[PDB]
Amino acid sequence: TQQIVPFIRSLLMPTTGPASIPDDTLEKHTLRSETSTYNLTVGDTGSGLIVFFPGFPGSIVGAHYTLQGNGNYKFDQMLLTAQNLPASYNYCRLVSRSLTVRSSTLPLNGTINAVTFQGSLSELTDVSYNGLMSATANINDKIGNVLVGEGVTVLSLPTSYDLGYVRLGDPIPAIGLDPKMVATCDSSDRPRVYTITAADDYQFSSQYQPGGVTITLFSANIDAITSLSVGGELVFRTSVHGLVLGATIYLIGFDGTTVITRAVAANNGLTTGTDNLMPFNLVIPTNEITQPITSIKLEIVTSKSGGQAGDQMSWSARGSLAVTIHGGNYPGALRPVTLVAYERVATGSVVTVAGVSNFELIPNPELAKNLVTEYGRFDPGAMNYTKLILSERDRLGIKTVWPTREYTDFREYFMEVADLNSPLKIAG
Amino acid sequence: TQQIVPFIRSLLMPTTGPASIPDDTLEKHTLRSETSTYNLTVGDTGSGLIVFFPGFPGSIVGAHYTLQGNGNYKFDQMLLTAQNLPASYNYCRLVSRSLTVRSSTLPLNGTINAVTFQGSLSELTDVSYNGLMSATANINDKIGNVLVGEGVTVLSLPTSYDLGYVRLGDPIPAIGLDPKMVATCDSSDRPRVYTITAADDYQFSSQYQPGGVTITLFSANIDAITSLSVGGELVFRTSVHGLVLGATIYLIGFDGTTVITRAVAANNGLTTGTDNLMPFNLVIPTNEITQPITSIKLEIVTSKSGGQAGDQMSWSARGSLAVTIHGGNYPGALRPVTLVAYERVATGSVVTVAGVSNFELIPNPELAKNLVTEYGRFDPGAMNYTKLILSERDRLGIKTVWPTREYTDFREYFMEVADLNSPLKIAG
Amino acid sequence: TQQIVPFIRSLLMPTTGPASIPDDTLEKHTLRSETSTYNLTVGDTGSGLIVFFPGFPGSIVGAHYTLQGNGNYKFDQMLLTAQNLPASYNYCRLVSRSLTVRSSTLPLNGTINAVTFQGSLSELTDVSYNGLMSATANINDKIGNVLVGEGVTVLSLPTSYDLGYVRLGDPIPAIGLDPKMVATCDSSDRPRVYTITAADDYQFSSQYQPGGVTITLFSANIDAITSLSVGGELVFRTSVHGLVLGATIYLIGFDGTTVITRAVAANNGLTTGTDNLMPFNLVIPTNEITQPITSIKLEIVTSKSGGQAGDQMSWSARGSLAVTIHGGNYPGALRPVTLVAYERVATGSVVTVAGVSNFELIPNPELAKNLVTEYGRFDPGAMNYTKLILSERDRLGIKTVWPTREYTDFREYFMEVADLNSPLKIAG
Amino acid sequence: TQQIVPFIRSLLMPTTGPASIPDDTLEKHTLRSETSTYNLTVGDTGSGLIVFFPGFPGSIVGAHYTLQGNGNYKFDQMLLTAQNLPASYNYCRLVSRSLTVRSSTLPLNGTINAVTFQGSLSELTDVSYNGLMSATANINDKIGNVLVGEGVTVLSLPTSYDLGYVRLGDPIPAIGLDPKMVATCDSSDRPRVYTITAADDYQFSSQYQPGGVTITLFSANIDAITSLSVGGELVFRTSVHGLVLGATIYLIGFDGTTVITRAVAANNGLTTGTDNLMPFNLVIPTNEITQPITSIKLEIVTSKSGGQAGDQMSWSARGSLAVTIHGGNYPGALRPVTLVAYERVATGSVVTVAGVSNFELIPNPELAKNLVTEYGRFDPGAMNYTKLILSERDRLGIKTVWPTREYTDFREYFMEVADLNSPLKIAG
Ligand SMILES: [Ca+2]
Numbered sequence A, B, C, D: 001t002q003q004i005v006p007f008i009r010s011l012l013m014p015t016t017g018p019a020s021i022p023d024d025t026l027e028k029h030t031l032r033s034e035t036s037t038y039n040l041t042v043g044d045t046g047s048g049l050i051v052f053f054p055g056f057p058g059s060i061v062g063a064h065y066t067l068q069g070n071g072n073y074k075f076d077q078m079l080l081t082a083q084n085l086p087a088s089y090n091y092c093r094l095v096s097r098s099l100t101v102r103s104s105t106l107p108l109n110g111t112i113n114a115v116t117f118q119g120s121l122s123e124l125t126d127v128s129y130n131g132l133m134s135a136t137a138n139i140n141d142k143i144g145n146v147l148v149g150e151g152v153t154v155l156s157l158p159t160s161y162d163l164g165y166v167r168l169g170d171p172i173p174a175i176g177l178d179p180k181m182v183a184t185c186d187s188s189d190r191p192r193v194y195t196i197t198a199a200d201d202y203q204f205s206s207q208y209q210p211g212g213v214t215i216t217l218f219s220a221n222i223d224a225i226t227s228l229s230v231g232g233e234l235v236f237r238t239s240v241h242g243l244v245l246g247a248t249i250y251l252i253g254f255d256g257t258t259v260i261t262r263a264v265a266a267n268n269g270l271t272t273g274t275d276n277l278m279p280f281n282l283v284i285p286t287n288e289i290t291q292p293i294t295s296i297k298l299e300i301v302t303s304k305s306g307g308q309a310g311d312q313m314s315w316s317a318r319g320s321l322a323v324t325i326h327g328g329n330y331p332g333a334l335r336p337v338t339l340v341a342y343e344r345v346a347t348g349s350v351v352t353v354a355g356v357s358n359f360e361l362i363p364n365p366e367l368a369k370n371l372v373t374e375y376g377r378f379d380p381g382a383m384n385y386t387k388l389i390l391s392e393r394d395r396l397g398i399k400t401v402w403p404t405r406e407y408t409d410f411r412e413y414f415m416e417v418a419d420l421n422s423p424l425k426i427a428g
């Protein structure tokens, strides 16, 4: 520390403002801060979960779920940046981010558990208040039973530098006959791909039914916050004449709710002694994803034209699907997740979220006319200092989740120099 | 203090993370932290007791008892580590541990008394809120009438170094016809042995009874949290024909409740003019011990085949028993106990427990495939510094039980160097 | 030597008082001295033997035997600490110990031979006055023909540091119907185990006898001062109908006397063509051991229901037993033995024993209320200095058995600094 | 201050533990701390008084009185040390003491006034909440209108050093026919003596009454917490035949309640023309004094054998009494009193008292067998430093009664060195 190092200051105290990342990604950019402010209402059980995406390169900060009588979560709302970055910028990179979670009202109240998990949302094996505590072995990535009144601070720590600029989901110039037409340029670099072999000569056998017989061929945990696509093909064989197949893909939210439902093939006759192809050509736009996607499943309906008492409908199925979630493997886009769980909070009280997110940004064409961009400030040793700090992360006690009181202490313990500027004022 | 000394840091501030014990026990190990988080509910009397085992080499942290109208305690639950260490590790050693106890919700709220007692649970003569205060003469091992809102901090101070690695109660590969079959390898090194001479020619005499005459031959305070065994033999002599003996061993919990009941001999004819042997071959597995064992008693039922009005049944008994509690004398396993008693807390309010336990661990065979182990970091003078600190324990005011506010102050008073790392960043 | 080193002072001059052992066994403890004072009477032969247990962690110091006309020893009494430590303390560790043995009255007076033997009492091959001298090859562990008037000094030298605290045989809270009921918590850590395969298809054959035929199946040298147990099983096979077996275990004292006798199976019918089990479930409490146990033997009585002239009773026997003596392998508990033999002392004269034993102690629950405990005084280099001294033991002539006159000289030769305390008195 | 001075540390921060008083009273002693913990219930008026005896050499810490509707106090309970010192020790000396008084529960809340008065309880002219404030002129011995939630700290400041050891009221070995027999050895050194000349030829005159005529001859304020005796004699003269005198001594508590009542002479005929003696031979044992004694009064009943309408009974009385309260003048035994008054506290709320008392102690014969005693640690300049500190008491603002918040600040302002122990750890 001398004066200090703008980037370290920004990284460890994001509410302080942005600084350019001192890596090798030399783009002309501009630096911005976006606040997040939410007043969430506590449900009947007095318990709930905030899912944060600490590294998300853009306006999505997290999602809030209340816990319900029956032990299920129920989606409340997305937690966003104050304004929608893709409306003004085309490219983006996360510099630093911190968020605060505490109670502010009573209609001395409940506790919080928090973890930073090194995987995407659907990968967590246990998301209960208590179960959170073992999502990492890292002591500085979990905090237990912090009083809600005092609150918790979530600090975003890096998962890789020299990251590319991410395209935001920015609207692209387009005209179309449909009012509800939407055209964007999506986060794409570093896609995540899931491959699901749904069937390898899977035999299906069942008696006839008016209305048909529905099965769930498979269900698989995947993650999506933004646009994705499904490709691939199932091949069906049969000895039985006049079978008609229906198939639907469901994308399921964290709360078990159907987020998106897409008929992949409806009313589709099967021919005897031949391959019957069922292609998958699904594109799911960002705006359709009303809450984080947690799993995908495929249902198949089998029915017969004629039909009787005992008819026995049978088919064989083979094939694999590929689920590409665009930009999904970009560190921060899905990957690190910070969960903040609260319980025993009085029903009707307010859980207050306040955060600052800092970005390197490239303006969209209209803003670029009035927004000057520059290469980052050069200070050598900024990156080495960051590397040193992170290297000593555990001995310094630099947490991703803090009791706010401890984070406040840390701020003043660190940051003991901010020294005006000695004789520039008297120099010459 | 220079930078500092990882071990001292861990010992005095366990929430900070683990460090290797700088003794002579050089094993390849790995270092881990496990949190403990509980939200306990206050009962009708507004009063209760938390029993901590500050030195326990494993996942058992303590037990919670509520105090009842009639002045008895009633077991609530075991307080454990976040995850069950024996499921993942085979050997273990406690590095450091701290726990916090404070109220978090209102249904401001009562007082705490706490002590660290240099003996096992059943050895305490007085466990009432007030009586606690005289369990030690050591001023830094007791704290009185701390406000519950502010809370108490329990700090685990060593009871011996150069301790062996303890085998956790880890499951061992086994197949068996019984679904409920359980096979473990238990904490064994340093067993504790109790010897009870239950009778030395004890004469029994009583009139006949349909259903028999039951006596409690003896009752004795012992301690067990994990597996134990009972061995030995009673020998019975008699002049009366056709006497049948029943005998049962009861292991009683801290709350006076029967934890385990084992028939040692049921329906057992006594022959005239001969020794009649009653062997003890009891093995009590860990999983059967649902709460800490506090005493053992033996009941004997005496009945006669025929029977009338006045029949006078008599026998003479001789023999001693041995109760071996496996690994019981391992310092920390039973020995030091920290009691945290609360009273005058409003009924229905939450007493919140949060702790961190630090361990040296050896992975089980499956984890050992992916868990690198190492000999501890060498720093000379770490142990001498520890010895110095502990030697000056009282003048430094290093308590095992703290008002949390005072412990917090101590943390910042100590730990005045954590200094980044000066020119490594500028060296060469 | 600077001032000096409390521990070295205590180790080499125990009459000086206790000091904490400077090892890694960091327990809160208290330091105490216990004297031993005995005036033993010399028997008819003018000859006898004192067996010392120099390292015994507790109140047992040794035992006195007189030598008799027929060349046998006869037990006189146990030599103990002034007060019974287990009545006041639960845990204990030996710091240092010295004892003096000299004549004090005339009814000038005979000679002493002494050795420190690196094994337990029963392991000595030769315990005669003269034979002692070859129990070790170590010149500083034997002393020959010291005049009784001048006397001998026994100095306890370490057999391992970093020893655990030993549980004393302390009474445990217990109620029972029998007045003579005794419940203790025994020295257990580091048990010693003997395994005796008493028979491997041993054939027995003998003619009938009214009253039976008794054999001694085996006899084996073992050591016990405190509680022990016998486990295991013999299995008997036979072709002869109506055989009844009796079996008794005898624990024999150093003087050939029966200390303890326990019927293991009395009146026990053997069935033809089957295994007949004879289990061993013996627990022998400390208080029953009136003098050191030196061997164990098992007698078996064989009798027949019917019986005639020539009947030939036969059985086959198989099995092994295990004798566990609790805490038996704890260095000091049984292991080093110092023998002080005297002869040619006038009958009726007094052999005077005076000693000091120094301990680290943990008080029992009742005393713990008024007994402050602390971690040991820290002085670095205390242990290294001890290691150096012991490393040079032979060149320094540090004996375990001394002519008292030579030990006295050594005391004043060593210990040439005890220097008041220069200007603290004038400092500031 | 260098490191510091154990005694000053103990004196100014008693919760820190005991230290030997650095005066000339060189006794082999032991050092102990005793906590005091009470949860007092607030009465109907929301107002009450705690009387502390800050210098009391023993287990009596103070007494709690609630204030009542009618403006009278009513005794609640004695405030004691955690355990009864006289059960374990025979002699005692107070080193240092501090106590904390604050509210803890609610069914913010009230105020506290406190003073240290340089006299015994009964000597206070005004004990009302407001009146307290003028019991001393010393600004550092009074504190006004401290919030109850924050609380008050009572610090015991010396009233003389070189005090003798005080005998505690320890039980003495005794057998007697009465179960309720009690034999103690009492605080005696430095008795306090009151002399009351109850009459100097006091003429009594009154008409006859069936049942008699009762008068209160005198009433006088005295102080007693422990055993006292009354000696002396009244002499009665009369001209009237057949007068019978009854006389009773009452010892009255602070709350106006009779603590002890003793008939001094019942039914006692007076002879004409002679001295009629009425001796006083009262011994009042400690255990009879259920609350502090505040005054003594003597009532006399006068009756006549015969009796009529107008009979005029007359007597003359002369004499003085002496009330000796044993050890009463020992500084601390009665003398300094600290009053903590609260008012406007909500009815039913808890006023929490927590304290530490530090003592030099000599064990009773049974404990002396296991309790090592020593002369105090020598440090020169300890007493001079104490004398300096006290000499500058007012400029340093060292109070006997503090707002707890101010005392806490003082603790950290003082006590700025507690410095581990620099290179002992690296010396040689
Ligand atoms: Ca790079």
Ligand SMILES: [Ca+2]
Pocket: B023, B024, B162, C023, C024, C162
């Ligand atoms: Ca060692």
